[PDB]
Symmetry: C2
Subunit: 165 residues, 2 copies
Amino acid sequence: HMRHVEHTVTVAAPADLVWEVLADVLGYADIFPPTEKVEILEEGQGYQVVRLHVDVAGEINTWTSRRDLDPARRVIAYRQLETAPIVGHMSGEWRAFTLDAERTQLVLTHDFVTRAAGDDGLVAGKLTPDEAREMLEAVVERNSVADLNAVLGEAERRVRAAGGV
Amino acid sequence: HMRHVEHTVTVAAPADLVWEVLADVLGYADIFPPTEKVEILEEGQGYQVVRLHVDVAGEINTWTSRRDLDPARRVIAYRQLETAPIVGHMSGEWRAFTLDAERTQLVLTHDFVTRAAGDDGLVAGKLTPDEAREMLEAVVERNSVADLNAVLGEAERRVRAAGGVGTV
Ligand SMILES: [K+]
Ligand SMILES: [K+]
């Protein structure tokens, strides 16, 4: 069972400026509170392969993903390659829509399922399948909100600060 | 103070078809399961005032909203002119964005506060303000999700029927 979630927020910054914020993955470490570290492993026109260090209920976790960036639509399609230990699949999109000249509807979606139990009955040697399912939802819920708000806050900081006065 | 929430769903239908489902409030009692009855009190170019019977939690709530419809903007601004007893204010927007030719991002916002405590310290002579708050978050959260999904199910249903080759 693949789960689909979407969250949104309204940002008082133009879409082009929100896009600049989304596109700058290395800046995620400075603005995303649960994001410790970001490495660009590979990169070219229209894509970034990235390794992430992020916490998943109280501790630092690692995974890799491909980002495909569509500046004209202002969509970033992400997909995990090497998955978090309780993650079987994880992908989704950041979308910045134009609401008017100065405001953006910002969307982040998640398509995800937990890793299957191993031969010991547990997911990643620790969790019951039911407990891994509920921890993955709680983590997506929590980081979705914190991520959307971190982007909004940084876009509005640049309008106030970086623009003026 | 006033609360503000936003929920969204991606509709596998074009934005114009989603607009059509949003704009036709006469269809809302068919398309929204908790909606029992809709009634048009006032209607003109760009606006509808509408009386609604909607079950929330236990039961049947009645309210009246002014819908300002803006098809070019793909936005319906709503403000409730008569509300349920625990509700002091209730307004928001539907917003449909073209994602591509076949898909639409669908958004529903709520701006809301509980009714002000009366001289007894209760809201509608029945609830502490904390109780009323707590109950209104639950009900906005629940119905917001149900409404978004009603609209999506309906628009996608209509894509099937317009793409329908006849059978037995
Ligand atoms: K950080
Ligand atoms: K109904």
